[PDB]
Amino acid sequence: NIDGYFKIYSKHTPINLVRDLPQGFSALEPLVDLPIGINITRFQTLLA
């Protein structure tokens, strides 16, 4: 969140992994940028 712009970068990859974050290297491409101007300080994730 820089100068009012909320920027998202992301990646997907296929895995075959039991219960950990996998060792490897990835480059996240930017997917959207939002000129929202709001201050942020806190967050949560929403689950099914």
Partner: protein, 48 residues
């Protein structure tokens, strides 16, 4: 000395130039205190 505060405009097609109705738009704007979210058209020309 009680008075109702409003009055209606006698707009008739026979009114003189002056007493005829005029439509007005004021394009009011406040400048350069937030990230730009309107601009004039950034004109373009042929690729050579």
């Amino acid at each position: 000395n009680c008075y109702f505060p409003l009055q209606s405009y006698g707009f008739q097609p026979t009114n003189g130039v002056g007493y005829q109705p005029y439509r007005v738009v004021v394009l009011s704007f406040e400048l350069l205190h937030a990230p730009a979210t309107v601009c004039g058209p950034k004109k373009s020309t042929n690729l050579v």
